[PDB]
Amino acid sequence: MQGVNIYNISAGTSVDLAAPVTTGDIVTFFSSALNLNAGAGNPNNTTLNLFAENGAYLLHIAFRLQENVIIFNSRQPDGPWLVEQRVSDVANQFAGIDGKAMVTVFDHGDKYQVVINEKTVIQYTKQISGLTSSLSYNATEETSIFSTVVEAVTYTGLAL
Amino acid sequence: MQGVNIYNISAGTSVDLAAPVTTGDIVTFFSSALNLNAGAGNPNNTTLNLFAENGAYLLHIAFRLQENVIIFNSRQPDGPWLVEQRVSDVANQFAGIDGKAMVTVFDHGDKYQVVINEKTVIQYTKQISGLTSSLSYNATEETSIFSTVVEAVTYTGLAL
């Protein structure tokens, strides 16, 4: 059946999903703030991650203000980061909405469609497949471009 | 491809969807407040609605604090209300989360699954079918159980 699950993710923590996210499902991260004047990341200001059951990063989204780019990649639990994808101009991706932001990830099976607000920023061809069993929002309170707590909501059972 | 559309609806207004909502799509309403002690509704404190192009109420969701019930119904343009469905105890449906609320409507084709936060409150068998082309949030800035402005997000193009 179709379900809605809400998770309040504090910066620097991960959460295990009650219902896994698979093909046809959706995960959205909501930030109650947009700090485009945050200091330099270390090197990341913020990262949003979808993990497989074995800890592999199915999708790693990293926002870097100083470098002015958004990075997308994957990695096996104890393996090296794979082929990195990049999109320039961070502020441009959030244009239109101030004081808050939303990042939606559609699991298309063969790809992860990432949407910032209403704009599709990348059609990420997967480097690692499988269902998403946990999520994380990593950043420090000093330099995150998002609120200290990001609300993740999953819409599952969509494909039936 | 799938899409995400964001709308900010002020109490007592409606918005026309850039991308209509059909079978397999999702509509979500986000409130940055939850006032379960709001004044007397007359008889409604808050209503969330899905309209067809012709003005039909595909889904009318009415929150009534004093009658302590959430009503669900439909009606044709210029027509009388159809068969009403009810869910008693408004506060209980929002139990678990304070200071905010989320209402999700899944268009399952034959029914509208309404979920308040994480709880499915009703599997509403449609009385009127068709595409949702308009949304509304009706209430006064004094007796609404939700914030002055409710953000509506639609996830479309999901089925095909």
A95 close to B (CB below 8 A): no
Ordered by start, the domain boundaries in chain B are: 1-160
Q: Compute the CA torsion angle B105, B30, B135, B35 (nearest 10 deg).
A: 100
Judged by CB atoms closer than 8 Å, whether chains meet at A113 and B1 is answered as: yes
- For B94-99, the CB contacts below 8 A with 24+ separation are B94/B34, B94/B36, B97/A6, B97/B34, B98/B34, B99/B33, B99/B34
Which pair of structure tokens corresponds to residue A23? 């093909």
- Distant-in-sequence, close-in-space partners of B90: CB < 8 Å, separation ≥ 6: B36, B63, B64, B65, B68, B69, B70, B145
Query: With respect to CATH, is domain B1-160 assigned 3.40.190.10?
Result: no
Sheet containing B26-31: order of strands:
B3-10, B149-156, B26-31, B101-107, B111-116, B119-125
Supply B1's token pair. 């491809």
The nearest CA of chain B is from the CA of A37 a distance in Å of: 24
Chain B within 8 Å of A72 (Cβ-Cβ)?
Answer: no
Cis peptide bond prior to B43, omega within 30° of 0:
yes
A125 forms beta bridges with A111
C-beta atoms of B3 and A158 within 8 A: no
Alpha-carbon torsion (B28, B31, B34, B35), positive or negative: negative
Q: What was the resolution (in A) of this experimentally determined structure?
A: 1.9
| Method for this entry | X-ray
Q: Which residues pair with A155 in a beta bridge?
A: A4, A26
